[PDB]
Nucleic acid binder design. Structure first.
Ligand SMILES: [Mg+2]
Ligand SMILES: [Mg+2]
Ligand SMILES: [Mg+2]
Ligand SMILES: [Mg+2]
Ligand SMILES: [Mg+2]
Ligand SMILES: [Mg+2]
Ligand SMILES: [Mg+2]
Ligand SMILES: [Mg+2]
Ligand SMILES: [Mg+2]
Ligand SMILES: [Mg+2]
Ligand SMILES: [Mg+2]
Ligand SMILES: [Mg+2]
Ligand SMILES: [Mg+2]
Ligand SMILES: [Mg+2]
Ligand SMILES: [Mg+2]
Ligand SMILES: [Mg+2]
Ligand SMILES: [Mg+2]
Ligand SMILES: [Mg+2]
Ligand SMILES: [Mg+2]
Ligand SMILES: [Mg+2]
Ligand SMILES: [Mg+2]
Ligand SMILES: [Mg+2]
Ligand SMILES: [Mg+2]
Ligand SMILES: [Mg+2]
Ligand SMILES: [Mg+2]
Ligand SMILES: [Mg+2]
Ligand SMILES: [Mg+2]
Ligand SMILES: [Mg+2]
Ligand SMILES: [Mg+2]
Ligand SMILES: [Mg+2]
Lengths: 81, 199, 61, 84
RNA sequence: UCUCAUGGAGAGUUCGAUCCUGGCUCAGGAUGAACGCUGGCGGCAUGCUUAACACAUGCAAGUCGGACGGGAAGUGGUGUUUCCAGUGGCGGACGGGUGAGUAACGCGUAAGAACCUGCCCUUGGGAGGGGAACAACAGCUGGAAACGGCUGCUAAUACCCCGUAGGCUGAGAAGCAAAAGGAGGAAUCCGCCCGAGGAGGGGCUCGCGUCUGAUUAGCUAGUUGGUGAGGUAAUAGCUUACCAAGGCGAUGAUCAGUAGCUGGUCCGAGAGGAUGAUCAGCCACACUGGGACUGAGACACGGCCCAGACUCCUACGGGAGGCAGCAGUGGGGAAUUUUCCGCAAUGGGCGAAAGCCUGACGGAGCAAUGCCGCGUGGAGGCAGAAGGCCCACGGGUCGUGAACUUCUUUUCCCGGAGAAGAAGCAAUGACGGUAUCCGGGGAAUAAGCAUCGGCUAACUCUGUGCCAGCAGCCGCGGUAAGACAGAGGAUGCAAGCGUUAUCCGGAAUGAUUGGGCGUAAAGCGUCUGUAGGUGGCUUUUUAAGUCCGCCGUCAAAUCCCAGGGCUCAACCCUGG
């Protein structure tokens, strides 16, 4: 199954995540095939390219809890269906 | 990570260092020891030219050798680009403006949180100040007195073109990038590059 | 193998545990190793001030 | 370019023909083009090939152990018998 | 007078002396480091390279009562409700650890055809009617224990049959194939059966690249090839019977030895050399070997069966177990850590949901192991004095150094305030009263290590007398030692400094770039010739090599350029 989650890469006690689509059984720092966003809680900035994300969601990609919340604040679901 | 020693002991042998202290040596001690020293080797001449940078800026070889790599990566006049990194240090800029009598004296002011840059405190004597950067003191009367005492209790040297001063805040401002001919120390930069040719 | 005893004076005797390092002595053919002073059983050199780290000797105080 | 040509020596076996392939490639240390050789096994169900002929190979699903190619005719040749 | 180029240093030693040739040695940088002396703090990282030796103790994979029957607790021994040993469903094939084995489709790269694929997404059609069991449980019974035995009863999304079919078999006629219900103010969600697709994942095949040795030259017999009969999810000697005699190799077969591979790491002027820790991907292994079941998926680290070695329990009949999971112990070794806190975040599994589990992961602690950063005071200090060393005995040096006087408080001590990280109305923080800010006190809390014959920056005196001893090379010391030891002084580094070990460079000393063979090491005693290498001139053909323009790909991280963010840097992030 394909899934939209986020991996950690940064400094200790300074979390800086990036959104990416990879297989579920792969580990957190797994081989990527398409990076589709960037996010951090401290600065609270987000690019979140929509054309790539909709390509996976049409094919059955299931977001996680927080990635659902990130996409919820965006209006991507209304144009997705 | 600091000298903490006598300075005239080196100025007799090394050369002249206005950056360290404007004082001068007293005695041409003995003709005997000058006869003992005599000539000098080429490696020693390249060595003594390097040591002048170790005192005029208060820097370590590890801290210095890093700047050598940045100059080698930078294209054109690696000797000149080296001084562009040293002269832009905060410890030199606060000195050349005249806010302290000695660069070690200026290094202390930076360490004990007496100066701020662009509205923020800077506790790093090795901070690289960019063009169009403001340098102001803090609001405490202790901080204001130390800079005010430096600008009042003795004459002031003519400043460069790339530095200004507003006497109402007692502050400064960096205009542009330095030229290699406005260094505050008589240098032969090429010999320094010849010393680090091995490394 | 056989090693060299650097320094002046030693307390080593048969059935003692030493710690060997590299380095050869040209003047002695066949010797290609040195022992460390200030270790398991080899003690530091007595009355030594200069070059004190090369022989395992405490600093005077 | 895409597929490999070869000479069809040792065509004795049934429904199969051994084939010798040749290629040139530069030596990595000295950059000289050396003539290397490698053999393969193909199949011609019509048995339309014999020793001395020129043959082209194609990829296909495996027929047996070490025989994983198909023998076809050459595409680009330069016979040009007695042109002005 | 453009632009490109940011990059190549040598020194000593053969001789009485010189020019060469040729080895040895040094100056550089790096490390999963170790030892020695010394030692203030902070930030980011790292931490069994040896015995894949053996392991005490605790934890590391559970979850659903909204699938089912029973049982327990509580209550007003009554309703709701809470808990679960068993049946059933999903996950236990992910994640974690380790490189023993492996020289080959294992890895990397670039292509293919004869296949599978639970969960997710999309989509076309269905779920009708009946029956029989094992658990649990009840009774009896055998054992020291682990675990059982017998006799009867029972539910289900568990089992079986019938019926139906856009599917399967076949040339066709014909033959065969299913399902499960649960929750509910009833709209109606979670599911089940058949079939066709998408994505991801996995299996198979192939081109190219992929260590050493010729004092290993012949190897293979299901071996190369076919047919028929088999078999696998699928192609295939994958298996078998017969037939044919091929298949590999001197461009290195076979045999032997070594080794996880790669992105990358280090060195280098470059070409290239060495290397495969941390991070990331693939493969392989799970006490040593063999085998299979289950399932969409295994020949399964914390699953089962058998054999073997070892350890533990035993009532001696018989049983239990596999830290190359976290932490930790013993042992080996020069040498590498707490038997810690928490699921707050990230991610994973189950569940309709609430929530449960998660030694993965996120944090703390130990270590100067490494990289980076800041201190161990600034300024002034007239003249003179004590003291150490040296002297041509007049003086010189240690030395503005110290004393002394003022100034400041990173750091230090005391006392307060105090987060972000949390995404989700509110609440929800292991770290943590952590970072951080304000106030008070006061130079108060903080420098050592090596070297000083030449290479190689830095010198005298005393002592010793080829003695004690130094040394990387040349070599110093035999009574005035700049080479030993001490002292003073100096130089170079700096919370580090040196020694040793390992790799590269220097080394043009394996010379493609970039060497040589008259006498310094080097032309077979000579000739003929196989393979192989190269090959005269002129006009055409093709476009394999070669050159140009586009497309795809060589992951991310790292390196390079730019930009931004941590008070700067290391470092982190964005883009190319
Ligand atoms: Mg440092
Ligand atoms: Mg001589
Ligand atoms: Mg190991
Ligand atoms: Mg259910
Ligand atoms: Mg239960
Ligand atoms: Mg399953
Ligand atoms: Mg039926
Ligand atoms: Mg076989
Ligand atoms: Mg066949
Ligand atoms: Mg191995
Ligand atoms: Mg070179
Ligand atoms: Mg073991
Ligand atoms: Mg398992
Ligand atoms: Mg285990
Ligand atoms: Mg362990
Ligand atoms: Mg959690
Ligand atoms: Mg979670
Ligand atoms: Mg638990
Ligand atoms: Mg140490
Ligand atoms: Mg002073
Ligand atoms: Mg010298
Ligand atoms: Mg010595
Ligand atoms: Mg003497
Ligand atoms: Mg000496
Ligand atoms: Mg070479
Ligand atoms: Mg030669
Ligand atoms: Mg001769
Ligand atoms: Mg000769
Ligand atoms: Mg001939
Ligand atoms: Mg890349």
């Amino acid at each position: 199954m394909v899934k939209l989650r986020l991996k950690r890469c940064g400094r200790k006690q300074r979390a800086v995540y990036r959104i990416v689509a990879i297989d579920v059984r792969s580990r957190r720092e797994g081989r990527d095939l398409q990076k589709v966003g960037f996010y951090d809680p401290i600065k609270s900035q987000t690019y979140l390219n929509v054309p790539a994300i909709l390509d996976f969601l049409e094919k059955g990609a299931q977001p996680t809890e927080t990635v659902y919340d990130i996409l919820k604040r965006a209006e991507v679901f209304k144009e997705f269906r | 990570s600091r000298y903490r020693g006598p300075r005239f002991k080196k100025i007799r042998r090394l050369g002249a260092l206005p950056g360290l202290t404007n004082k001068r040596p007293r005695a041409g001690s003995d003709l005997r020891n000058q006869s003992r020293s005599g000539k000098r080797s080429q490696y020693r001449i390249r060595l003594e030219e390097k040591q002048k940078l170790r005192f005029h800026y208060g820097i370590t070889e590890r801290q210095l050798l890093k700047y050598v790599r940045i100059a080698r990566k930078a294209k054109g006049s690696t000797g000149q680009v080296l001084l562009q990194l040293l002269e832009m240090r905060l410890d030199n800029i606060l000195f050349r403006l005249g806010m302290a009598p000695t660069i070690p004296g200026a290094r202390q002011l930076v360490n004990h949180r007496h100066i701020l840059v662009n509205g923020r405190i800077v506790d790093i004597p090795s901070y690289r100040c960019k063009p169009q950067d403001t340098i102001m003191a803090r609001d405490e009367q202790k901080s204001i007195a130390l800079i005010q005492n430096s600008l009042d209790l003795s004459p002031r040297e003519e400043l460069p073109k790339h530095l200004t001063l507003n006497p109402f805040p007692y502050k400064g401002l960096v205009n542009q990038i330095i030229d290699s001919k406005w260094v505050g120390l008589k240098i032969n930069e090429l010999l320094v590059v010849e010393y680090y040719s091995r490394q | 193998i056989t090693a060299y005893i650097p320094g002046i004076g030693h307390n080593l005797q048969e059935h003692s545990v030493v710690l060997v390092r590299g380095g050869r002595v040209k003047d002695l053919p066949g010797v290609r190793y040195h022992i460390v002073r200030g270790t398991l059983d080899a003690v530091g050199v007595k009355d030594r001030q200069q070059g004190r780290s090369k022989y395992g000797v405490k600093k005077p105080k | 370019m895409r597929s490999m040509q070869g000479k069809v020596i040792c065509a004795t076996n049934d429904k199969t023909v051994n084939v010798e392939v040749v290629r040139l490639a530069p030596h990595p240390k000295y950059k000289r083009r050396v003539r290397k050789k490698k053999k393969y096994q193909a199949h011609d169900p019509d048995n339309q090939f014999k020793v001395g002929d020129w043959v082209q190979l194609d990829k296909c699903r495996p027929i047996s152990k070490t025989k994983t190619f198909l023998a076809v005719a050459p595409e680009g040749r330069q016979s040009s018998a007695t042109r002005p």
